[PDB]
Amino acid sequence: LVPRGSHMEGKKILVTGGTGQVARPVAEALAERNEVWCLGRFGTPGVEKELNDRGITTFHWDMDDPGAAAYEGLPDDFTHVLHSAVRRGEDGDVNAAVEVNSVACGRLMTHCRGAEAFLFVSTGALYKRQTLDHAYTEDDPVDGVADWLPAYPVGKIAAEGAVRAFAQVLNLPTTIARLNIAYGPGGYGGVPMLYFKRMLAGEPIPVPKEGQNWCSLLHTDDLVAHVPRLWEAAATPATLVNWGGDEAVGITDCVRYLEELTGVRARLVPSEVTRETYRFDPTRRREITGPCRVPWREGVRRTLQALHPEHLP
Amino acid sequence: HMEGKKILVTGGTGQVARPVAEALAERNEVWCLGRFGTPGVEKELNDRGITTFHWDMDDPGAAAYEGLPDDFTHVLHSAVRRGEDGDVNAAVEVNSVACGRLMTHCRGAEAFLFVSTGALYKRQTLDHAYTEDDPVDGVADWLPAYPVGKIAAEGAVRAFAQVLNLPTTIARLNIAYGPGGYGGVPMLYFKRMLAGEPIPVPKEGQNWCSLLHTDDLVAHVPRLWEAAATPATLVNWGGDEAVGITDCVRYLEELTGVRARLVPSEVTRETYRFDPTRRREITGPCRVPWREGVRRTLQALHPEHLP
Numbered sequence: 371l372v373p374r375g376s377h378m379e380g381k382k383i384l385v386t387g388g389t390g391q392v393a394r395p396v397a398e399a400l401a402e403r404n405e406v407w408c409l410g411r412f413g414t415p416g417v418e419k420e421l422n423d424r425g426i427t428t429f430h431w432d433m434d435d436p437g438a439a440a441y442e443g444l445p446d447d448f449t450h451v452l453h454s455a456v457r458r459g460e461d462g463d464v465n466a467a468v469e470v471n472s473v474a475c476g477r478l479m480t481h482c483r484g485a486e487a488f489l490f491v492s493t494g495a496l497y498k499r500q501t502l503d504h505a506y507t508e509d510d511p512v513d514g515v516a517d518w519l520p521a522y523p524v525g526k527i528a529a530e531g532a533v534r535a536f537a538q539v540l541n542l543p544t545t546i547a548r549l550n551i552a553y554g555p556g557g558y559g560g561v562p563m564l565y566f567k568r569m570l571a572g573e574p575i576p577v578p579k580e581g582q583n584w585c586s587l588l589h590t591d592d593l594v595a596h597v598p599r600l601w602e603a604a605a606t607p608a609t610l611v612n613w614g615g616d617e618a619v620g621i622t623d624c625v626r627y628l629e630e631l632t633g634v635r636a637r638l639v640p641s642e643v644t645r646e647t648y649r650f651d652p653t654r655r656r657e658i659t660g661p662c663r664v665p666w667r668e669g670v671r672r673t674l675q676a677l678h679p680e681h682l683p
Numbered sequence: 684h685m686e687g688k689k690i691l692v693t694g695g696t697g698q699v700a701r702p703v704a705e706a707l708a709e710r711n712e713v714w715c716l717g718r719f720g721t722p723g724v725e726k727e728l729n730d731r732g733i734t735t736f737h738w739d740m741d742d743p744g745a746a747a748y749e750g751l752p753d754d755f756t757h758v759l760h761s762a763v764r765r766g767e768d769g770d771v772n773a774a775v776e777v778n779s780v781a782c783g784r785l786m787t788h789c790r791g792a793e794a795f796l797f798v799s800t801g802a803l804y805k806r807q808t809l810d811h812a813y814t815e816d817d818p819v820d821g822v823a824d825w826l827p828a829y830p831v832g833k834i835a836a837e838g839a840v841r842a843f844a845q846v847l848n849l850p851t852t853i854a855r856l857n858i859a860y861g862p863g864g865y866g867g868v869p870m871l872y873f874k875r876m877l878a879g880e881p882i883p884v885p886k887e888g889q890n891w892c893s894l895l896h897t898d899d900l901v902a903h904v905p906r907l908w909e910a911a912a913t914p915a916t917l918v919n920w921g922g923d924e925a926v927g928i929t930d931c932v933r934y935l936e937e938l939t940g941v942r943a944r945l946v947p948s949e950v951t952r953e954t955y956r957f958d959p960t961r962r963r964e965i966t967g968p969c970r971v972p973w974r975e976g977v978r979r980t981l982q983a984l985h986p987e988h989l990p
């Protein structure tokens with residue numbers, strides 16, 4: 371039993387994507403005992419205020435500004451950087467996804483070239499499909515294919531190229547962590563709660579025509595604990611790691627568990643295109659972080675208790 | 684036209700950039716950076732007045748850049764590790780880092796030209812004319828690590844162009860052909876015809892490309908440098924004509940009397956036609972018609988097979 375603020379102390383941390391599902395808990399945890407700055411647009415009313423109240427310095431910063439003006443007034447003595455902000459490309463503009471994310475990586479790394487470690491969050495969506503249940507490793511083939519969000523993996527391959535190159539040119543120790551499905555009791559709860567909201571609405575949930583999709587769910591409390599360890603593993607050349615939990619979780623199994631807990635019935639629709647998650651081989655991540663602690667059934671149950679308690683018996 | 688410049692070329696032993704380097708050497712100081720593993724190729728370049736500098740993208744660190752001048756005015760980055768061995772991380776790392784180190788070293792240049800590929804476009808219909816805004820998926824079953832490495836390298840190039848304020852053009856090249864080297868895809872098909880090998884073609888229709896003759900390719904390079912900008916200028920770099928692959932092979936047979944052994948197949952190598960609108964705005968029209976170009980290339984490489 372140890373407070374999560376004790377994972378790291380006395381540092382000066384820059385976080386992008388600090389309003390988001392992944393990096394907000396990291397920024398909040400690290401703000402207790404470190405100086406934490408969150409850079410973003412803060413378009414959601416009240417979020418900047420909550421971050422400020424929770425001890426975080428906020429700085430307006432928009433990746434869509436192509437010039438360098440976005441960095442005026444930003445300190446250059448951060449020790450640690452988490453770059454989690456993303457333009458996924460839902461609008462289908464693949465050139466914009468490539469340009470905006472890649473240039474932001476280069477400008478941010480250059481600004482923070484004196485830092486001890488830079489952590490870039492990426493995705494497993496860029497893996498080439500083998501089978502739906504395969505445990506993807508860091509060396510498995512890559513393609514730019516995600517039918518559910520086509521521009522997203524392409525933008526991430528481009529950004530990873532920029533990150534690798536700047537890590538070497540600047541001699542800035544870096545980790546590229548290809549993240550799996552994050553979930554937890556903050557925000558909107560992650561993909562598991564997106565599917566629960568579809569269940570409540572009677573909206574169809576696309577599933578594969580053969581088999582089910584698989585993932586390596588990663589709970590917030592484990593994700594937060596891993597960040598200091600991922601910084602410690604940063605290197606030149608950049609360290610690459612598939613970042614997921616320790617349990618293989620079937621997506622349809624997760625939906626069935628939501629049904630069991632709540633009594634709400636799901637509508638599964640076999641489809642050519644699904645939200646195509648993958649599970650990861652946890653070998654390399656475990657080498658860096660040690661084992662995860664939160665079992666997924668316990669974690670999902672408590673996420674429901676936090677965000678949808680009225681639907682639990 | 685270009686004179687009095689100082690030009691850094693990578694990939695100067697290759698099919699694309701060697702004619703460019705040789706043509707620029709007449710009125711400019713040209714340096715070719717590479718490994719020169721082919722016996723005799725380094726001296727062939729030196730005999731044109733090209734300065735050669737041993738430079739290996741596989742080398743870790745910045746040691747490969749020791750002693751390299753930093754006052755180049757123009758850069759053509761054509762060298763590539765395509766990833767034939769399947770090691771996708773090595774291909775992504777080597778190419779991306781080389782782009783970053785080269786651009787940073789040459790951050791004072793007037794313009795940087797990066798050669799990319801059309802293979803990264805998401806496949807549409809056989810005769811689709813791909814534009815610069817068409818979707819991308821990095822799929823190439825024939826060389827999986829290659830388009831992925833080009834997407835990664837393009838991301839590095841775009842980022843360094845902005846960070847360094849280095850005007851850049853990214854030119855996604857089509858199929859190049861001409862009398863040098865082994866002649867390009869048209870001559871590879873002719874070699875198969877000479878060997879009596881089967882030529883796979885689609886069961887319906889044909890594959891389409893935008894062949895670019897190397898005389899036109901050479902002429903375009905100064906214009907591509909002139910179009911360089913921040914953010915990087917993106918252009919699909921092909922010829923002005925949609926060329927059917929089956930039509931090309933049939934024309935080879937028509938010229939030579941060597942029979943082409945076409946075999947309809949569900950699996951054939953994919954080729955891409957480019958919309959030439961943006962390239963033409965930058966370079967003007969091409970000058971080599973494809974039938975003349977293919978015939979002249981045959982005359983250069985296989986003269987005994989023309990009547």
Ligand SMILES: NC(=O)C1=CN([C@@H]2O[C@H](COP(=O)(O)OP(=O)(O)OC[C@H]3O[C@@H](n4cnc5c(N)ncnc54)[C@H](OP(=O)(O)O)[C@@H]3O)[C@@H](O)[C@H]2O)C=CC1
Binds near residue numbers: 412455457549
């Ligand atoms: N399960 C998941 O959630 C997974 C996420 N990832 C990766 O994790 C990282 C975070 O994802 P997640 O937390 O889900 O993101 P969210 O979708 O929850 O939020 C997006 C984040 O990006 C920031 N952002 C978007 N556009 C801009 C911009 N133009 N300028 C500045 N900031 C911007 C937003 O900041 P603001 O609100 O201030 O605009 C917000 O913090 C991303 O790199 C993503 O690819 C990978 C795999 C799974």
Ligand SMILES: NC(=O)C1=CN([C@@H]2O[C@H](COP(=O)(O)OP(=O)(O)OC[C@H]3O[C@@H](n4cnc5c(N)ncnc54)[C@H](OP(=O)(O)O)[C@@H]3O)[C@@H](O)[C@H]2O)C=CC1
Binds near residue numbers: 739857
């Ligand atoms: N039709 C075509 O030929 C097309 C080509 N392209 C692009 O055009 C560019 C040139 O292609 P092409 O001329 O066909 O290439 P080639 O296959 O003819 O030659 C490859 C070139 O890469 C250089 N190279 C490879 N590995 C290294 C290394 N480790 N260190 C230094 N140099 C290296 C070689 O130099 P050395 O001999 O000194 O080792 C050689 O000059 C590439 O970027 C390619 O992606 C795109 C579309 C079509």
Ligand SMILES: O=C1C(O)=C(c2ccccc2)C(=O)C(O)=C1c1ccccc1
Binds near residue numbers: 494549550551645647
């Ligand atoms: O649902 C996913 C997702 O499925 C993946 C992913 C796919 C395969 C392998 C690993 C991760 C993402 O990378 C991801 O960012 C999301 C996501 C997108 C928008 C909003 C919330 C989450």
Ligand SMILES: O=C1C(O)=C(c2ccccc2)C(=O)C(O)=C1c1ccccc1
Binds near residue numbers: 858
């Ligand atoms: O044959 C090709 C090729 O066909 C393409 C290409 C594909 C689709 C669209 C545009 C170009 C390449 O980009 C290319 O570099 C080669 C090549 C591979 C190995 C050695 C020499 C050349």
